[PDB]
Design a protein around this nucleic acid. Structure first.
Lengths: 46, 271
RNA sequence: GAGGGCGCUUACCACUUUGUGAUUCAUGACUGGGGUGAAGUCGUAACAAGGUAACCGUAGGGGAACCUGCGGUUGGAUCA
RNA sequence: AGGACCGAACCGACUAAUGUUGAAAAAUUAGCGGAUGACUUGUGGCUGGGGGUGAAAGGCCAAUCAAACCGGGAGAUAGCU
RNA sequence: GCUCGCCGGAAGACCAAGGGUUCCUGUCCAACGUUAAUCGGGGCAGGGUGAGUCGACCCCUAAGGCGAGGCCGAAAGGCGUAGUCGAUGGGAAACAGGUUAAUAUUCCUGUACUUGGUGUUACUGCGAAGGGGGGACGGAGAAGGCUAUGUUGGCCGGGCGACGGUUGUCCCGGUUUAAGCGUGUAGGCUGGUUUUCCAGGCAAAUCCGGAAAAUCAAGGCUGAGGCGUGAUGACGAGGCACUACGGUGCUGAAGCAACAAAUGCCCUGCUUCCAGGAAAAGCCUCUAAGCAUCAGGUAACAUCAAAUCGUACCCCAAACCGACACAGGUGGUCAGGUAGAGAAUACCAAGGCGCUUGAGAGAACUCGGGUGAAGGAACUAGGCAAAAUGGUGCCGUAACUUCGGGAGAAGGCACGCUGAUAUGUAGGUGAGGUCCCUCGCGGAUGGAGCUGAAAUCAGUCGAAGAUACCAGCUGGCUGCAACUGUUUAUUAAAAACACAGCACUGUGCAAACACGAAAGUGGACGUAUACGGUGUGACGCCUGCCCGGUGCCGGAAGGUUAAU
RNA sequence: AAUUCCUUGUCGGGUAAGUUCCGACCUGCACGAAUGGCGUAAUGAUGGCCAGGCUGUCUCCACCCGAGACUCAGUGAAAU
């Protein structure tokens, strides 16, 4: 039936997208914890 | 007019509609219209800040000259038409050198009438003058509360105001609400009564016809639980408490005025 | 053989079955108002200025005769 | 002319039916109710956890709910299994 | 391969977001894939989707987001003007014959078109982040002019037949085609010219807006098809030579007319309704600045580049999502023939598929179907479930009623096919001749051609014509909620919830009030016939008693009583 | 009675019997006139009852059909 995931990049890249996460108080902190975890990517949008 | 309806589905046969065949059914003057997008009763960051307001239909706003910019300029009433942003209908005024504005309507329905502000201007209603030049008992139409601030009060269908005293620099208004207060005699009055006057004879017909007039339902506070609306009470149909607002405060008879700026100009107030 | 019957058949058809809607006499738990006797009970409403003048109309009210309000009358007494 | 007649799409979820380590974390079938309307809906934006949003059911909020999910105080505390 | 079964408003074909080489070819055996694999959507090696115009970006804007200066908050951070982002919307410009293993409006070919640049010529005032115009918008319905398509003629090409009949009580295939430019018609809408005055459009303005006198109207604006034209072309039954064969690739005949209708066009037309239904830029004009060393404009001829990223494929799915290749989800495009009102449903095209575990057996029982004696709700807490009825034209139709309704009340009748009236009526269309011409792709008039009901009458078959699919439980008493609508998604769809309305009440606009201490914003840019809070819930007829309690409004003296 | 315990009250209508229903009686443990009191056109995929229709619901099931089941060759789980 209907899934809760419905794919669209316009919406997913303004949702969990890097550019406003890199421009907001707590979004900047996700990036700092991910540099500390040592992830290959900081983004989740590609 | 006003006139009765006819039934197409059960029931409408006793419903009444205003109908004003002396108003122009054509297009509004385009240089005066704005988008005026709805807000659904929700402010900038909200959440609801005024309840029951919600839905369309989509409607442009018409810019009216309530401030009555410039003075003594000869004009004519070129069109009388209906306006859904309001209820008293509108007048389209044309100044002698081709300037067009929307202005608050007279009681009259005859077009081509020549109108101007002034005191050597013809004594007729619709020719605006300062309240220092008029006698007691006069009906003043829509007025400004401070000189040059523009028209407030008695803007709704068939409404008016009366001047019941004058002395020195100030004039006393009697309001149809039961209020009596002073304003400066430098303030402008247009004289007489405002347009429509029939709007209170209308009775809508069917619940859906409000849904395109910016209305949505909301459930009775007495029909839900007290976590939600404070008027809610267990099992319902027998509250045992006073009726209240959505914030648990009195909703019959409790006065709420706290302005403290305009009150020293007031003589008598609404019951 | 024919002619004609008896037979068959097309038409109409008494008798006769249903559905649905009226009509009409009588009757029915019960009940409103009418009649009735009898020194009932309660009050005393009209006749006299009839006990707060009365009556025509009318809405409300009391346990009820009626009482109250307003328009209409004076066919009603008392200075009159 | 229609919150009108009927009836597919579509939407609703009243009755029947199959399913229950399901084909489906309520779905699939038939009847039924609606069907220019207070109808039904695509894309974006706005509102969020003692906080949202409700023609209300203290219903629902990314399979999780009268306080979801994730990370900390914290190997909390438990006359208790 | 051949034959079989199924879908065919989909189970066909195209597409946006979605993913991104899964496309096309060879090859694989190891892992994977509901069995087995020789197969792949899984692996390996090769081949490939070319653009000014089509997509996105370049440019514009809504809801909204962010934001120097200006403000709020310990602070992070938040508002908010200039400013800048913002698609689900606005932005000059395209058609389709070839060439292949994948694609092409891109390559090839023919032709048209947009913005800027560089030349060539004539004439020349052009012009802004400013003014005016435009952009520019809803809901429904019926006429008028049309069109892709289908149906049938004429035209082109063919058959007269195996089983019974088919050279005439006819059948098969073809009859295709453009953006653009023209005439501007149909359809639609509609007064100009001249002289001249003026307190408006933040400055200015020959644009637009306001007004007079004069004079005249048969002109103007807007735009489908038709026809022209792109085309003396392309394509096309065929024609022609040859590798003894994968096609080859030059060349070509007919290519016309009616009738029915849009889901398409005139149409961002008309009438009508009342909910009056985005903005801005590009675009068109007016003027400032700037300048004549020109630049720019109008007309005509030449001529350069036009980047950036996209383009394959799956696509209502084993290439998007479902843990999985799972009876699921799923915005948009398109609409053949018979029957039908229809995108129902029944049979079929074009086109696609055979539900990727199967083979026997013919047990109950079980899911789902078909028919059923003699009665009937006797069953069940519940006539639950099932069953009857049912179409679509006409007749007929109660109580109750607020006379609108009730009402599809109830009830009854008819139904195929053939033939004829009329070798086809009635309805629609329409040519010749004639008539009238604010003159013609015209109108009136009348019916050659076309499309063609339905009814009646009479026959004709069977017990049967709604001959299949299609398609109502009705009435009587009573409770309750006035009604259509809403709800516990997933045990409750209701009497609860909602509502025109009715009542009680707040509110004088820097309204009441909300969230935030505020910054702001919404109410509202509305103004007491308006807005907020609450209850009550059609209508009709009516509506007694109570101020002890609890809250409000007014009275304002006095009492209890704080800081001081 | 969408309200009444003893109580399945009473009578009329009614059923083969009705703790059903409708109407009447007041013979309602504290129904009662703005949450109104009571009727009531229209609406109902509506509770309590009746009639009329129709039946595999039933008396009581009988036969017929597919797809499972059964049996076979392959793939091959969970609670415990």
């Amino acid at each position: 039936m209907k899934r809760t995931f419905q794919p669209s990049v316009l919406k997913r890249n303004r949702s969990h997208g890097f550019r406003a996460r890199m421009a907001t108080k707590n979004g900047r902190q996700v990036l700092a914890r991910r540099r500390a975890k040592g992830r290959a990517r900081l983004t989740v949008s590609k | 007019a006003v006139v009765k309806c006819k039934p197409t589905s059960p029931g409408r046969r006793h419903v009444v509609k205003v109908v004003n065949p002396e108003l122009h059914k054509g297009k509004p003057f385009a240089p005066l219209l704005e988008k005026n997008s709805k807000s659904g009763g929700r402010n900038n960051n909200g959440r609801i800040t005024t309840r029951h307001i919600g839905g369309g239909h989509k409607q442009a706003y018409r810019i009216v000259d309530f401030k009555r910019n410039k003075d003594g300029i000869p004009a004519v009433v070129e069109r009388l038409e209906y306006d859904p942003n309001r209820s008293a209908n509108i007048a389209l005024v044309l100044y002698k050198d081709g300037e067009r504005r929307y202005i608050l309507a007279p009681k009259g329905l005859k077009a081509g009438d020549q109108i101007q502000s002034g005191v050597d201007a013809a004594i007729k209603p619709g020719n605006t003058l300062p309240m220092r030049n008029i006698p007691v008992g006069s009906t003043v139409h829509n007025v400004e509360m401070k000189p040059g601030k523009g028209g407030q009060l008695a803007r709704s269908a068939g409404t008016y105001v009366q001047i019941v005293a004058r002395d020195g620099a100030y004039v006393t208004l009697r309001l149809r609400s039961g209020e009596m207060r002073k304003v400066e005699a430098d303030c402008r009055a247009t004289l007489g009564e405002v347009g429509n006057a029939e709007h209170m004879l209308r009775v809508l017909g069917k619940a859906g016809a409000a849904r395109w007039r910016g209305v949505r339902p909301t459930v009775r506070g007495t029909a839900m639980n007290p976590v939600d609306h404070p008027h809610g009470g267990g099992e319902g149909r027998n509250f045992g408490k006073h009726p209240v607002t959505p914030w648990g405060v009195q909703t019959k008879g409790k006065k709420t005025r706290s302005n403290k700026r305009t009150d020293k100009f007031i003589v008598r107030r609404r019951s």
